Homo-oligomer: A and B are copies of this chain.
Amino acid sequence: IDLKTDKDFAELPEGTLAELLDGEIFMVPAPIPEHQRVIRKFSNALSTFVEKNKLGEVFFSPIDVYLDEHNVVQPDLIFISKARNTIIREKRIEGAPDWIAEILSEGNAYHDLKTKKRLYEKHGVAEYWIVDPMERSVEIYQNGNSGFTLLASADSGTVVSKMLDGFSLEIQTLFTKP
């Protein structure tokens, strides 16, 4: 009866990084450098492939993605196809991206693993990558007529996208350092 809405989410004080999940507002903790390293490496690989094949647009956090009145999320890495370009608005994304990756944080992984997995499934995100920098592993889910099914789960070798035909990723290169 007291669900928070996108209007409540918009009224948060300037300088607040939060997400609205199932009508509840959650503060997101500041990420640590290793989390940012992984997003940088993933975005570089994804952006290069998207740009070479003119597939659409890549964004990374912070960026608001409105899904419905009770759900506004800030995914780590998103891809929006040319066909769905109109969901990119002046101040946020309005509608589900085609493709999302979340990079886990040890103290805040439940929403990536459970709550947003269901949300992204419901709203038709076609492919969802969950990257775990603590286990140095990836899980890939593909959407379909019966929701998400596990496409790949690995901490070694190469994983390939299904919806981004030709995109592959050598998993251990997400986590390496000088």
Which residues from chain A sit less than 8 Å from chain B, CB to CB?
13-18, 27-34, 36-37, 39-41, 43-44, 47-48, 51, 54, 56-64, 82, 85, 88-93, 177-178
Contact = CB atoms under 8 A, between A and B. Distances in A.
Contacts of A18: 15
Contact of A15 (B27, B39, B89, B177): B27
Given A15-B16, A178-B85, A58 B40 contact: yes
A35 B58 CA distance: 12
A89 to B, nearest CB: 7
A37 B51 contact: no
Contact of A43 (B13, B30, B43, B64): B43
Contact residues of A: prevailing secondary structure: mixed
5 closest Cβ contacts across the A-B interface?
A15-B27, A44-B47, A14-B27, A36-B59, A17-B17
Contact of A178 (B39, B47, B82): B82
B32 A91 contact: yes
B51 A63 contact: no
B15 A36 contact: no
Given A15-B18, A17-B62, A91 B33 contact: yes
27 contacts: A14-B29, A15-B16, A15-B27, A15-B28, A15-B30, A16-B16, A16-B17, A17-B17, A31-B62, A32-B90, A32-B91, A33-B59, A33-B91, A33-B93, A34-B90, A36-B59, A37-B59, A39-B60, A40-B43, A40-B59, A43-B44, A44-B48, A44-B51, A57-B177, A57-B178, A82-B178, A85-B178
